[PDB]
């Protein structure tokens with residue numbers, strides 16, 4: 001059986017609407033006047049109205065720019081029915097997949113994270129864990145893949161490189177010895193999350209580490 | 214059977230190329246890797262290469278801007294063959310119709326027409342017939358429908374309106390009496406053929422009428 005191929009539609013389309021995606025046809029046009037229709041989430045089910053089909057021509061229509069972050073793929077079904085009201089074709093699967101654009105910056109779950117670590121802890125230890133999320137595609141592209149780093153550390157005593165972060169998980173570790181509560185009680189780190197695995201747009205949040213002698 | 218609908222492609226399309234018209238798919242993709250091809254005048258037959266198809270994806274491609282005046286309609290067939298070398302679908306007819314643009318001016322059969330009429334002829338008689346052709350569509354549009362007229366007459370003696378031309382057939386007639394061989398031997402008319410039934414682009418040729426005793 002010949003089947004309609006899935007339809008790839010890049011999100012945030014600028015062209016005019018409605019947009020013609022594809023066109024259905026039943027070879028039983030020769031014998032009788034045929035009428036086309038579509039059903040499924042996106043047509044007659046919520047979100048209703050996004051996809052429609054011209055009853056007599058069979059043109060699949062898109063009325064709104066799509067947002068991949070909202071719905072990545074729609075699973076609709078096209079129908080063909082003679083004047084009799086009875087279907088003359090088995091429903092056809094119309095898969096409409098939305099391609100991703102990097103239109104979302106990373107966002108930290110919280111503006112500020114609080115953690116704590118002890119005095120004589122050996123380098124390579126865990127302190128706390130911060131997390132940021134990017135709603136873009138993180139499977140086929142890097143538009144959604146988040147990378148972690150540290151922008152600055154205050155104060156810069158005894159050293160400027162007192163902590164570190166795993167680029168993928170975002171858990172902060174003690175990199176250098178010399179932690180002392182009597183000297184410095186709190187460490188204000190400004191952590192950074194950037195998409196494109198470090199090559200794209202960036203956002204920042206605060207991570208407070210109190211020391212425990 | 215769900216079949217691919219005809220494909221309308223306006224002639225003289227700008228880029229980019231190749232252009233994706235439609236895409237084929239056999240649901241036997243589920244079982245085996247399928248390979249696609251197309252045959253017929255326009256693909257493998259003259260004019261060869263105009264339409265081709267990506268073997269693994271099944272994208273129908275157009276490689277050159279089309280000219281309707283050359284070929285109005287292509288009748289191709291798409292094939293699906295499994296990796297094993299066996300056809301998995303009955304060939305499907307991919308009909309590609311080219312819609313017309315008004316890109317052809319009328320052309321007179323001759324750069325100059327020679328005709329003759331007698332001196333004492335009564336108004337309303339026929340003299341000669343000029344003809345121009347438009348290679349554009351004259352059935353669905355008026356891009357090819359030609360209308361005739363007279364731009365000038367030299368000399369303009371005894372009168373400026375000595376002749377006339379039927380707007381449809383293009384046969385020149387004497388509208389006014391007063392033809393004299395002793396006074397004026399030749400009449401250099403510059404006749405005009407314009408498409409759009411008189412409202413479009415125009416071209417002109419000359420029609421020389423010698424008068425006879």
Ligand SMILES: [Ca+2]
Pocket residue numbers: 011067068069070103
């Ligand atoms: Ca989006």
Ligand SMILES: [Ca+2]
Pocket residue numbers: 011068069100101102103104135136137
């Ligand atoms: Ca996106």
Ligand SMILES: [Ca+2]
Pocket residue numbers: 102103104105106134135136143144145195196
């Ligand atoms: Ca992103």
Ligand SMILES: [Ca+2]
Pocket residue numbers: 224280281282283316317
């Ligand atoms: Ca042409």
Ligand SMILES: [Ca+2]
Pocket residue numbers: 224281282313314315316317348349350356
């Ligand atoms: Ca034309």
Ligand SMILES: [Ca+2]
Pocket residue numbers: 315316317318319347348349356357408409
């Ligand atoms: Ca024309």
Ligand SMILES: [Ca+2]
Pocket residue numbers: 394395426
């Ligand atoms: Ca005489």
Ligand SMILES: [Cu+2]
Pocket residue numbers: 017018063
């Ligand atoms: Cu609309």
Ligand SMILES: [Cu+2]
Pocket residue numbers: 151152
């Ligand atoms: Cu700064």
Ligand SMILES: [Cu+2]
Pocket residue numbers: 230231275276
């Ligand atoms: Cu090409």
Ligand SMILES: [Cu+2]
Pocket residue numbers: 364365
């Ligand atoms: Cu002139």
